[PDB]
Ligand SMILES: *C/C=C(C)/C=C/C=C(C)/C=C/C1=C(C)CCCC1(C)C
């Protein structure tokens with residue numbers, strides 16, 4: 001009965017361990033992640049004057065997301081290198097008992113804080129038509145909170161009870177679907193009052209949103225996408241999961257923010 005290896009990262013680290021390549025690749029991608037959030041923070045601060053006052057709350061929410069993402073992705077990166085240590089005998093990296101072990105806390109806290117602000121910020125750039133600001137905001141905030149909480153409950157059972165990990169994943173996915181449905185309505189209403197140039201940016205925001213947000217549940221399932229005896233049920237699934245989370249983070253926070261800023265500028269021409 002394995003005791004030291006809470007999450008799939010710790011499990012692999014405690015059993016098979018990590019190759020020099022898997023350990024170094026993961027450390028570099030997590031470092032890239034926090035480095036891009038810091039670059040983003042400076043970009044959103046320095047370009048805030050490029051949009052009319054009425055849109056600047058969006059630029060502010062982008063900057064605030066970047067502060068929390070930078071700090072918590074920095075903490076996640078340090079957590080990776082501190083949790084696994086090289087054994088000369090076998091020549092791999094194993095879970096270090098003298099460490100605090102890999103912790104999903106940093107990532108899930110990041111999501112809890114930033115999901116509501118990413119959903120909120122579009123409501124300061126587009127105008128609704130038949131929907132109420134307060135109704136859309138409340139739906140986004142409730143569904144967003146329940147999605148991340150149900151997901152967090154799931155992640156605990158990942159190694160101890162796979163079945164529960166999936167059922168909680170499914171409940172989380174139900175809230176996710178409601179978020180996609182609301183955002184699609186917001187984007188369609190936002191297109192009504194604006195130039196074709198603005199409508200085209202909103203079409204690109206929808207595709208970026210749909211893809212980047214679906215990467216999260218994809219990374220959540222990554223180790224189990226080739227079955228329990230599968231090639232992903234390994235350090236390869238851990239590498240893939242951390243890579244996909246980093247791509248999702250850069251896309252859902254930084255690229256999303258840039259596109260909204262670009263939309264605000266096109267509304268700052270007609
Ligand atoms: C910058 C961080 C963002 C936008 C985080 C978004 C996270 C999700 C959309 C997560 C959704 C999940 C599911 C739909 C099912 C599995 C568990 C989650 C929480 C990963």
Ligand code: NA
Pocket residue numbers: 080081082083084085086
């Ligand atoms: Na180490």
